[PDB]
């Protein structure tokens, strides 16, 4: 399949080039990669390299613009406002899943979600508070919870993606050793099981007892059905094992 | 007067349905089936021919206005896949059996009843689909199936050429 | 006792019994599932959204 | 051990024997008064014989140390009860126990 | 096939290479280019044969070029130029 | 008149006081409100269709029901208990401690006395579909086989398609699930278990002895099998390098079982089948990748060279070449001896005889010449003296494809089998009673050379 | 985007493009309390729009930049 | 950080005790037992009445989302865990929860479904799967089992009638375990079933009167909380086969000549549909049972016609292939 190409003098005569345009609906496909992929990669690269104890204003650290950028991203992956009519809602779900799985072959498994997790480098948002400028660990919550929710609803999004957090269950454990976002882990679980349980098949006593230690510090999350009763059952459609 | 009353009662029967989105439902289920021969699409085609059944112009313009609004490509992709998924005589299995068709007729009848009454809009919209990004030429897609029938039935003749007479199963498979 | 009479009567049901004595249901059920007898004080006379439409 | 205490004894004589279904209507408890079992609400008196090793030996020793018609306040220990393993899902590790026992009959 | 590039797990310079794959990557991000034509006015013209332009890779943001060794390698904006980054189509395989 | 009056009563649209209630109240509920919650409006019109089509409740209920006598109502209740216990472990899936309950339920079902005497229960209840669902829930994809205990295959093969002596059509359903095995074409053996694909035994038992089902096969169901055999063209290096030789070295076998399946594919009860054998030969011939140790053009494709090469690996050392002398009746010796024996048994079972129904006048001469081109077939007289069961295949090649000077080249089916069979019915410690069948079978192979 | 150095480097037009969605007079003013390929005249009240992003460049309360120390 | 809130106005009581204080020594007495539900939990306790929670909406969500957990761990067959949960949530708590009228609706539905998911979610789940098979043994009981009882062709009644089909069976254990799950799930212990059978009918007969008036006060909050868990409990008890004809006549008397005619919301209608489905399935089973009863004497008479004109097959003369077989 990897027929690498080099510009020969004449080469083969039977080497025709048929064309495919990004069609009307694929103007969205053209728009996502320009507006949201390359720019996001550059911005996150600048901030990630700067988070390794580097001089602040010499490379991209635009904290005015990075927060605005991830807010625009969250608006891009927003759900379709359930009160809307049926066909518009389903078209928006189509577009949402397209711009999810189109990040995915670009590297949600490898780079993009790896870029978010790589952007989680924090000892403490208090100890970094008097290091670089005046603000390092302000909006960890937004990036963390929201875009992890985007991934979990992507893994929902195309019905055979249980690829990164279920696949890299070490990166699921990287969530469980921190315990601030118990509002995307359940988005992984209750969509993993209906597809196929991949996440739940190595998690163990050492995870559940940590969650139970957290549970003393809670008032029952109010989607506890999702986290614990999908750790058990998957809402009536289970896998016995 | 018998015939005319039959026609008018048939139109009343069809208007019980096509005033309630039956045609759009038919096009929707055919677009959902992306080239998968099944019974769920066969019953749809039976409903389509049953509502059309005499060149009903109302349901024709309804279907056409729907497709020009939505610009759904899955309808034509589904049809062109369905034709490739349709069957022919299969001489070898008949040789083995010496010791799939109602669907095709209903499909092509549904395709015919859109262009009945010399509807010049549907006749052109099954060639170009000019409003849409992507096009399918259904007309060539049925010519190709005609070739795939002609080759099979000429082979079935050549099997029976040198022989004397024809049995019952061969003549049924012919008809 | 033996099951072969059950498979007798299964083939019997399609041939000797299954017919327009109950296959006349199709027009009656549709003429009864259309009307929408209501009085919502907005309709023309009836048909809020009839069941067949639903 | 079974540090038996009485509540409203009867005859003080009709002690149980081998092959005798002690018909009990007990009401178990836990330390800190957190209830864990009963039989009064079921209206289903317990039934167990002596020496068959059905029950933990606390109930058997309490019945052997008991007469008919004898309401009591038994007190077992982890040595005779589920121990440092503990019955899973109900009993924690290393738990003392209380029982408002009341024997009625023997068959 | 489609003029693909390898994935981003080696992002420094290994993405400057090229591979083909006619599988599922026909739909997705890496298999997408852009005709950054040189003519400013009428850049959105109906394109015809014999018209130079410079290709661009959307996901990485690097223009196509052809090095002195007769091998294709991408190029940033600073390095590109009409010598290297200037390509056009041929209807027939004849040169003329 | 009894039956006619009964049909008049049953087909009274019988009990209409419940039906007049349901059919009017559902339409009333649809009339008085534009109702959301589409799981309600599904059920409403389900019942409204049902109360008119009362016969439809019967047409998909009479195939399910089945009558029995008063004596059989105890063992069958244990069967229903076991089947419900399995059905509660069906879509909800494999488990570690659920494995054991599945195992014991299948054992209790096998050790029952119901379908021994009853001709159609286990197919109507959907036991085969249930168990196949359990298997695909175990497997899912490749590379793992986490639960390595598919005793399901033992149930299906060694009981379900062999209880069909009472009614052959149990085998028909597993042949329909050969379409499952098409996508679910699987490689794992729960047996001696080197590499030999025990769910292939299901496809074998599905078409073991039936002309109808073997004719109902088709070419793409065999193209992928011969592709897997083409994939078996790789060399032998270690004792048992399964895919890396972890700790244990005994024997690899990968290609024998596909050929053992194709034997049942082409060869029915008696005379072989041509409709499948022709395509099998035409497909084998494009990629005849039986690459033995060293011969011209191909790797091997020649029997005496590879066999005498491998007997050096087998006789003094173990199954492996470099191993300390441990091998006898080891059915790396095998998969290089037995592989070509199975290949030859297949090819002999493919082709017809001279003065058969076709005396070489009906396009069979092409394939017979193709067979004749592989002579080494004249030279297998040496192999007929050089396991005893390997040589019966080559005898079948001779008997099916092949004047008395050629007989008298041997002078017998073989002097040494004759002598050792004469001497071996004399009870002794060693060199005796291992061949109680291993050479006492050779009457079955030699007597057809009466002629 | 400096296009004058077109030969030394390429520019980007996809982020420079704009589209004319509307054009009126100043009197066309309603406050809420088309025609199809009209022309464009001097003095008209125009509306721009970026092509690939739908952010209408329009009169907004931008009061941020202070390079000149009085400019928007 | 909470603060020990010094103003705490919430539920007082409604029915305290019916004491009397009589003279001749100042006698006092009461013979009217009462009890109520506490709340004290080993990771956050708060000793109050259960009915003191309908005014505060931060313990109610906790208790509800714990009852859903209790129903989850004991789901799709799990008996050890039900034996464990029976210590926490013993019978009279459940009986008082269903019988009470002033509770919140969330805890009502939760305690109802927790009753179901550790009493009525193994046997019913089993026989629903085995419902659509209709296997029969042939006995003399399976011959007076005709379509109609009388010759008037009257419509009959569904549930009343002899079944004679090999439905599965129901066994039980006690909570203090031995053989926790071998064959025992009537309840995880034994539940008293007849009192539940009666109390469901009593609650239903009260609830039709409660709902007909369009009262501002249903049991919990609204009418869906009133009707939904009650009806689902009634359904789960119906499909098991507990109910006698005496009860089923009362049940039909509720709705036939009532409940279906009453105004209702959607999710109650969704359950009434399932009840009606079970009735039609019972009718179909009666139909095929009558068919088998006919077919016994019919096939016995018809093979006697073959025996009349004795005609035979291959050399094993008078073999049993002449009656019904082809091989």
UniProtKB/Swiss-Prot annotation, chain B:
Tissue specificity note = Highly expressed in heart, lung, cerebellum and brain. Detected at lower levels in adrenal gland, stomach, thymus, esophagus and ovary.
For this chain, the Swiss-Prot or TrEMBL PTM comment says: Channel activity is modulated by phosphorylation. Phosphorylation is increased in failing heart, leading to calcium leaks and increased cytoplasmic Ca(2+) levels.
Subcellular locations according to the entry: Sarcoplasmic reticulum membrane
The entry summarizes the disruption phenotype as follows:
Embryonically lethal. Embryos die at about 10 dpc, due to defects in heart tube development. Cardiac myotubes display enlarged rough endoplasmic reticulum and cytoplasmic vesicles that contain high levels of Ca(2+).
Q: Which domain of life is it from?
A: Eukaryota
- Read off the domain note: The calcium release channel activity resides in the C-terminal region while the remaining part of the protein resides in the cytoplasm.
The record's function comment reads:
Cytosolic calcium-activated calcium channel that mediates the release of Ca(2+) from the sarcoplasmic reticulum into the cytosol and thereby plays a key role in triggering cardiac muscle contraction. Aberrant channel activation can lead to cardiac arrhythmia. In cardiac myocytes, calcium release is triggered by increased Ca(2+) cytosolic levels due to activation of the L-type calcium channel CACNA1C. The calcium channel activity is modulated by formation of heterotetramers with RYR3. Required for cellular calcium ion homeostasis. Required for embryonic heart development.
The subunit field of the Swiss-Prot or TrEMBL record says: Homotetramer. Can also form heterotetramers with RYR1 and RYR3. Interacts with CALM and S100A1; these interactions regulate channel activity. Identified in a complex composed of RYR2, FKBP1B, PKA catalytic subunit, PRKAR2A, AKAP6, and the protein phosphatases PP2A and PP1. Interacts directly with FKBP1B, PKA, PP1 and PP2A. Interacts with FKBP1A and FKBP1B; these interactions may stabilize the channel in its closed state and prevent Ca(2+) leaks. Interacts with SELENON. Identified in a complex, composed of FSD2, CMYA5 and RYR2.
The UniProt entry's sequence similarity note says: Belongs to the ryanodine receptor (TC 1.A.3.1) family. RYR2 subfamily.
Q: What name goes with this protein?
A: Ryanodine receptor 2
Q: Per UniProt, what is the name of the gene that codes for the protein in this document?
A: Ryr2
**Shown part of the complete sequence:** 3714 to 3906 of 4966
From Swiss-Prot, chain D:
Query: Keyword Isomerase, does the record have it?
Result: yes
Domain (PPIase FKBP-type) spans 19-107
- Superkingdom is Eukaryota
Task: List keywords of the entry alphabetically.
Answer: Cytoplasm, Isomerase, Rotamase, Sarcoplasmic reticulum
Q: Transmembrane region positions?
A: none
Q: Name one GO molecular function term.
A: transmembrane transporter binding
The UniProt entry, under SUPFAM superfamilies, shows:
FKBP-like
Top-tier EC class: isomerase
| Localization in the cell | Cytoplasm; Sarcoplasmic reticulum
- Single GO cellular component annotation? Z disc
GO biological process assignments = 'de novo' protein folding; calcium-mediated signaling; insulin secretion involved in cellular response to glucose stimulus; negative regulation of calcium-mediated signaling; negative regulation of heart rate; negative regulation of insulin secretion involved in cellular response to glucose stimulus; negative regulation of release of sequestered calcium ion into cytosol; neuronal action potential propagation
- Catalytic function, reaction form: [protein]-peptidylproline (omega=180) = [protein]-peptidylproline (omega=0)
Notes on activation and inhibition: Inhibited by both FK506 and rapamycin.
InterPro entries (alphabetical)? FKBP-type_PPIase (IPR050689), PPIase_dom_sf (IPR046357), PPIase_FKBP_dom (IPR001179)
Cite the record's tissue specificity text. Detected in heart muscle (at protein level). Isoform 1 and isoform 2 are ubiquitous with highest levels in brain and thymus.
EC numbers: 5.2.1.8
The record describes the protein's role as: Has the potential to contribute to the immunosuppressive and toxic effects of FK506 and rapamycin. PPIases accelerate the folding of proteins. It catalyzes the cis-trans isomerization of proline imidic peptide bonds in oligopeptides.
Task: Spell out the family assignment given in the record's similarity comment.
Answer: Belongs to the FKBP-type PPIase family. FKBP1 subfamily.
Please give the subunit comment from the record: Identified in a complex composed of RYR2, FKBP1B, PKA catalytic subunit, PRKAR2A, AKAP6, and the protein phosphatases PP2A and PP1. Interacts directly with RYR2.
Q: What is this protein called?
A: Peptidyl-prolyl cis-trans isomerase FKBP1B
What organism does this protein naturally occur in? Answer: Homo sapiens
